[PDB]
């Protein structure tokens, strides 16, 4: 019996290389080869596949990428036409962002790993430099969602079993828009300084221009970027220090073809010892049936089979993705792509070369710098926090106590001079009392500097269903403390059980 291994390549040199590779692999039944060039329209190409590529149909088709930067519309129709009959697909170089779904694509095997493994490498690198704070931001809808989900399931599963990295803020924006200064300033207003990004080429150039406008390179902003953003179109406007990654053998199509034909020959030799073989028909028209050999062959291929080739040990995870790839840690050493090291498996290997960081700093920057300007919220309560209008000079009238000591007034900035009929922020109204006096003693003891502003709603806060939406949100002080509008609550706030779920109440000031 003969097994005609179908294929679809873009250049005749690749076809000759595949012919030589299958002739070499025939040394170890018989094997053959069939190749069809890529068409500008995927419909006619799909017809040629259904008519010529699967004219024998007993094989695992392999597909490559065209020089076009699409990389999705060209590999998707072969995968669809092969998964119709549950025929496995081999992928040499593809955008593995969407192709990792077992429901959309039934059977699909790739050679290059997706960016999920790149996020895993990012996490492994973070585990070395003790960076426990990072603000990521994704741009693409699916690719960005997949990268975010991968990073979240990596950081959360490790946190369950020091403090351990917290992704401080996850930002998302449109990959087609250009106004991101709002999100840039929102990220700047945070504490973390280890911004990891995962955008497209044009989006990378736009965010680089935005960061250069905001000057996010003052020797404190560590950058971690992907391979899709180190291209020349974005490297032309890329800042220094932008540590990036790059996979080895990204354009070597012949080596990928050799590895694919080797592993498929190994899979054929392993599966030929089975019992039932449902040979696909010699023609795709009129044959409405499922090949029983397809799923079982894919299962016995992905289970344990592997053939060492140009990339060494090649293990497939449970998604149709080749694992244990090679990542080159590249740093922008003054517009020079120098290899700081290599990555393989789970261990990171640095070449011990001259490694720098953005901003000219030759030392490892810290993860973050804690701010000493934390906002403080306060309520107006009768003997705790007095609220009196300020004098016209700018300060307010200072009085003496019963003994002759100062009264320790603080300049509150809350809207207490207006009514709910016309809410408007008014002039600062100096405030004083028992727990504002407590607040000054805490500030001198731990040497921080604080401002204060009263609440907007007025109530202390509880859980209530919103008027229009479905989710429940807190109110007043609790809402302003949770939603990043206040870092502390210096006011009489009775400790409860419904509030300790999301708040960490210290030891009680007074019973």
């Amino acid at each position: 019996k003969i097994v005609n291994i179908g294929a679809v390549l873009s250049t005749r040199k690749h076809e000759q290389m595949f012919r030589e590779a299958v002739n070499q692999a025939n040394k170890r039944i018989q094997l053959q080869a069939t190749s069809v060039t890529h068409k500008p329209n995927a419909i006619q190409m799909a017809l040629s596949v259904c008519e010529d590529l699967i004219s024998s149909q007993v094989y695992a088709i392999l597909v490559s990428h065209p020089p076009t930067p699409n990389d999705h519309f060209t590999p998707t129709p072969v995968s669809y036409t092969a998964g119709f009959y549950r025929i496995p697909v081999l992928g040499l170089t593809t955008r593995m962002s969407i192709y990792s779904d077992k429901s959309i694509h039934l059977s699909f095997l790739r050679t290059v790993p997706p960016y999920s493994h790149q996020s895993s490498v990012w996490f492994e690198m973070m585990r070395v430099y003790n960076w426990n704070h990072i603000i990521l931001l994704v741009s693409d809808d699916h690719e960005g969602r997949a990268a975010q989900k991968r990073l979240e399931t990596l950081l959360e599963e490790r946190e369950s079993k020091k403090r351990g990295p917290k992704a401080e803020k996850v930002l998302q924006f449109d990959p087609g828009t250009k106004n991101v200064t709002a999100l840039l300033m929102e990220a700047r207003e945070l504490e973390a300084r280890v911004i990891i990004l995962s955008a497209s080429e044009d989006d990378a150039a736009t965010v680089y221009r935005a960061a250069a406008m905001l000057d996010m390179t003052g020797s404190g902003y560590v950058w971690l970027v992907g391979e899709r953003e180190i291209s020349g179109n974005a490297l032309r406007y890329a800042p220094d220090g932008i540590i990036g990654l790059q996979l080895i053998n990204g354009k070597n199509e012949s080596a990928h073809i050799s590895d694919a034909v080797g592993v498929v020959a190994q899979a054929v030799h392993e599966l030929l010892e089975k019992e039932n073989i449902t040979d696909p028909p010699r023609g795709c028209v009129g044959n409405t049936n499922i090949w029983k050999t397809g799923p079982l062959f894919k299962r016995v291929l992905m289970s344990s089979k592997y053939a060492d080739g140009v990339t060494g040990r090649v293990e497939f995870n449970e998604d149709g993705d080749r694992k244990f790839a090679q990542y080159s840690i590249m740093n922008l050493q003054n517009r020079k792509l120098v290899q700081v090291g290599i990555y393989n498996g789970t261990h990171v290997i640095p070449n011990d070369r001259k490694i720098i960081w953005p901003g000219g700093e030759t030392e490892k920057p810290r993860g973050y710098q804690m701010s000493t300007r934390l906002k403080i919220v306060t309520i107006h309560q009768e003997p705790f926090v007095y609220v009196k209008p300020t004098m016209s000079d700018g300060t307010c009238k200072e009085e003496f106590t019963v003994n002759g000591d100062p009264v320790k007034k603080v300049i509150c900035t809350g809207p207490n001079d207006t009514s709910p009929g016309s809410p408007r922020h008014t002039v600062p109204q100096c405030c004083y009392g028992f727990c504002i006096d407590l607040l000054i003693k805490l500030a001198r003891t731990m040497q921080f500097t604080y401002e204060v502003h009263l609440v907007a709603d007025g109530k202390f806060g509880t859980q209530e269903r919103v008027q229009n939406s479905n989710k429940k949100e807190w109110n007043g002080m609790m809402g302003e403390l949770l939603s990043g509008q206040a870092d502390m609550i210096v006011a009489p706030l009775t400790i409860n059980n419904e509030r300790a779920q999301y708040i960490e109440f210290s030891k009680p000031f007074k019973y």
Binding site: N41, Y80, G83, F84, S103, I104, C284, V285, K472
Partner: protein, 370 residues
Amino acid sequence: SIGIAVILVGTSDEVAIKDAHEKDDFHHLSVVPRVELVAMNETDPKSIITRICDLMSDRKIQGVVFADDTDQEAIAQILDFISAQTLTPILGIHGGSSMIMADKDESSMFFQFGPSIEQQASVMLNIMEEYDWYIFSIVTTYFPGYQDFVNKIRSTIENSFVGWELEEVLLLDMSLDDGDSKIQNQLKKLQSPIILLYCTKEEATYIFEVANSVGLTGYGYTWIVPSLVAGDTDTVPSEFPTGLISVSYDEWDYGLPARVRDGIAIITTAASDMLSEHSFIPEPKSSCYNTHEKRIYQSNMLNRYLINVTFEGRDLSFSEDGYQMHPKLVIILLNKERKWERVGKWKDKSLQMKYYVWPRMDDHLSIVTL
């Protein structure tokens, strides 16, 4: 003349579909009901592709209704790929190839008559709420869609003031006896008289027989499951118990002529609205053999108004993913006779389920009070 190609394959449904054109309810004098009831029996990729390309090249087709008889999602994949290629609104409605698929590409947004996993989770929680079953668990597998299911369950479980008691969430893997020991110990530790799962048919049978071997009978454990393990009816294995509650689309009391007339009414109304608010219709480039004709993708998206269509006094809106906003779900339950009959109905966030108090699965006593 808006070209409407209605393709029916597999079975033979030569019926009064022409009543759609005989209704004469087309107010806008531009959507000509050019129906093409082409039939075929070979549901092959090349066959359907050549058929749709020849039909689009011979006539001026702008909307492709579709129906079938098999249960293969690959037909829906081919349909969505053709929609991406030629950028024309297509309709696969209640034929058995609707088979809702998620994370669709940036194609011409088309919707298929099928409920989303989120809507199924919502209707199952409404079912659990109707009978005061405020305790359950989650037993999912490594099938694409479990993450969305558990995320919807969590988003709906902590956004209300109802005391839902989530016992434990399981993530089983079909690798070796380790998963068997895990599911056995967990189901022995669950002790909750409501169980949910999400996997395929064979995995469902495996899990059910394993649980019955561990002792998951129908006395207290009342299993609930979406329509993923049900599939085509009248093929019930022996592993399924007599207490399984499943939900599914309106497969019984929803006629195929009604489905095709609703689809053609949706298409005509959307085209009418778009051509009345834009006063310009794009050119149906009938190449399907050269990417050079794809340059016509410059006008406003027809889908932006197609997803906002209503007719016959019924809301027929759609989302950007391609699923119904009102799927008109129906509850199904299998008795000891190994037959799936309807129990309740869910439509427009309203549950009209009959059989007031749970056709209960010798200690069950009623009590009179005043």
